[PDB]
PDB file of C-alpha atoms in Angstrom:
ATOM      1  CA  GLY A   1      16.436 -13.173  10.587  1.00 37.52           C
ATOM      2  CA  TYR A   2      15.796 -12.655   6.882  1.00 37.39           C
ATOM      3  CA  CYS A   3      15.842  -9.403   4.909  1.00 34.16           C
ATOM      4  CA  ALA A   4      15.252  -8.587   1.242  1.00 34.72           C
ATOM      5  CA  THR A   5      18.177  -9.865  -0.827  1.00 33.04           C
ATOM      6  CA  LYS A   6      19.119  -8.854  -4.369  1.00 32.55           C
ATOM      7  CA  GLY A   7      16.229  -9.319  -6.779  1.00 35.11           C
ATOM      8  CA  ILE A   8      13.735  -8.996  -3.935  1.00 35.93           C
ATOM      9  CA  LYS A   9      11.269  -6.105  -4.083  1.00 36.16           C
ATOM     10  CA  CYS A  10      12.028  -3.368  -1.552  1.00 32.49           C
ATOM     11  CA  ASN A  11       8.858  -1.319  -2.032  1.00 33.85           C
ATOM     12  CA  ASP A  12       8.260  -1.916   1.676  1.00 33.99           C
ATOM     13  CA  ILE A  13      10.717  -4.504   2.991  1.00 34.88           C
ATOM     14  CA  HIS A  14      14.292  -3.402   3.684  1.00 36.16           C
ATOM     15  CA  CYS A  15      17.453  -5.205   2.577  1.00 36.42           C
ATOM     16  CA  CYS A  16      20.023  -6.717   4.939  1.00 38.73           C
ATOM     17  CA  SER A  17      23.036  -4.626   5.951  1.00 39.07           C
ATOM     18  CA  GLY A  18      25.102  -4.532   2.773  1.00 35.07           C
ATOM     19  CA  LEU A  19      22.442  -4.160   0.090  1.00 35.09           C
ATOM     20  CA  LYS A  20      20.735  -1.088  -1.366  1.00 36.68           C
ATOM     21  CA  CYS A  21      17.013  -0.564  -1.955  1.00 37.26           C
ATOM     22  CA  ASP A  22      16.652   0.478  -5.594  1.00 37.34           C
ATOM     23  CA  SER A  23      13.803   2.992  -5.403  1.00 33.66           C
ATOM     24  CA  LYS A  24      13.844   3.102  -9.204  1.00 32.28           C
ATOM     25  CA  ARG A  25      13.349  -0.619  -9.820  1.00 32.71           C
ATOM     26  CA  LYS A  26      11.628  -1.152  -6.469  1.00 31.67           C
ATOM     27  CA  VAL A  27      14.103  -3.937  -5.698  1.00 29.35           C
ATOM     28  CA  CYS A  28      17.272  -4.649  -3.720  1.00 27.61           C
ATOM     29  CA  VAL A  29      20.651  -4.370  -5.444  1.00 25.96           C
ATOM     30  CA  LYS A  30      24.345  -4.849  -4.679  1.00 23.72           C
ATOM     31  CA  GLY A  31      25.863  -2.224  -2.400  1.00 20.26           C
TER      32      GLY A  31
END
């Protein structure tokens, strides 16, 4: 469907298979 891509907050939403959820910046980053 549509996950949280780079630059998108991951405080709750998860990123698509291939991205990491930066718990430090509360956002998705490159894997």
